[PDB]
RNA sequence: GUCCCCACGCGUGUGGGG
């Protein structure tokens, strides 16, 4: 009942890597290969994130898996694989953690039956604040507002046309219910979990 | 500027029968 974290530094000289970097769907098919058997048996929840490019340095993909991944299934010269390490998220009540989450703040419009993205930063934060509170977490806050800043807001258009709003959050949260908090980290947060969203990363 | 599928809420009713 633990987790695995893998750091994949992709090689921009690879044609397979450039393809997967442009297409979150093609990245999803490639990353699924490492835990192909566990997904076939329906006991795996794959979560990944393309880390924000600080510039200069190569693309970094962080992959979280419930079962141990076998990264020998990647193409030759695809990525520099940093060995997967067992992740025990030992959480106590009232513990405060720095978090990073690229997610899809959206709502199911009842007039259309469709799922559309939220527009204002005020309701994007309100969405995050709701999802964390439902998942046993709670956003810390000062007197200006909640402890979170939106760093990226890009409208993704995956050609398999999949259209998902990708919002990158970063700030500080608190653990209220550690049992709920453990499950939230394992499940992920919000839609588009296959397309590189949902992965909630926590650090002290 | 949400493309497809599955499950399920909240609020408020319409019409018929005895």
The values of phi and psi at residue A95, to 5°, are: -75, 135
The values of phi and psi at residue A156, to 5°, are: -80, 140
Q: Name the DSSP class of A59.
A: P
CA distance A79 to A61: 9
Rounded to whole angstroms, the distance from the CA of residue A159 to the C1' of nucleotide B4 is 13
CA distance A42 to A203: 29
Nearest to A175 by CA among A135, A145, A143: A135
Rounded to whole angstroms, the distance from the CA of residue A161 to the C1' of nucleotide B5 is 15
Check if A1-89 and A90-204 are the same fold: yes
Protein residues bordering strand B (Cβ below 7 A): A 104, 106, 110, 114-117, 119, 155, 161-165
Sign for the CA dihedral angle at A95, A181, A8, A125 comes to: negative
Radius of gyration of chain A (CA): 17
Sign for the CA dihedral angle at A168, A185, A114, A125 comes to: negative
Query: Which alpha helices (DSSP H) does A62-139 contain, by range?
Result: 121-134
Q: Which two tokens stand for residue A173?
A: 């949260």
Q: Which two tokens stand for residue A60?
A: 């970094």
The values of phi and psi at residue A165, to 5°, are: -80, 125
Rounded to whole angstroms, the distance from the CA of residue A23 to the C1' of nucleotide B17 is 59
Nucleotide nearest A119, from its CA to each C1'? B1
CA distance A113 to A184: 26
Rounded to whole angstroms, the distance from the CA of residue A110 to the C1' of nucleotide B10 is 13
Domain boundaries, chain A: 1-89, 90-204
Which of 3.30.300.250, 3.30.56.10, 3.90.420.10, 3.30.70.1210 is the CATH number of A90-204? Answer: 3.30.70.1210
Specify the CATH architecture of the domain A1-89. 2-Layer Sandwich (3.30)
Nearest to A191 by CA among A17, A66, A24: A24
């Amino acid at each position: 009942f633990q987790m695995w974290l893998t750091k994949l530094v992709l090689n921009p000289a690879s044609r397979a890597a450039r393809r997967d970097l442009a297409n979150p769907y093609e990245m999803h098919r490639t990353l699924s290969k490492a835990v192909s058997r566990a997904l076939e048996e329906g006991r795996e929840r794959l979560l990944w994130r393309l880390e924000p490019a600080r510039g200069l340095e190569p693309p970094v993909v962080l992959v979280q898996t419930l079962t141990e991944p076998d990264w020998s299934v990647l193409d030759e010269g695809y990525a520099q694989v940093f060995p997967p390490k067992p992740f025990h998220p030992a959480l106590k009540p009232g513990q405060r953690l720095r978090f990073r989450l690229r997610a899809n703040p959206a709502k199911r419009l009842a007039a259309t039956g469709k799922r559309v993205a939220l527009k204002t930063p005020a309701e994007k934060v309100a969405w995050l604040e709701r999802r964390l509170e439902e998942g046993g977490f709670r956003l810390l806050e000062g007197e200006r507002g909640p402890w979170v800043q939106i760093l990226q807001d890009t409208f993704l258009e995956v050609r398999r046309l999949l259209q998902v709003q990708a919002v990158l959050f970063e700030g500080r949260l608190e653990v209220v219910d550690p049992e709920r908090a453990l499950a939230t980290l394992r499940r992920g947060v919000g839609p588009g979990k296959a397309l590189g969203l949902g992965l909630l990363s926590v650090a002290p």
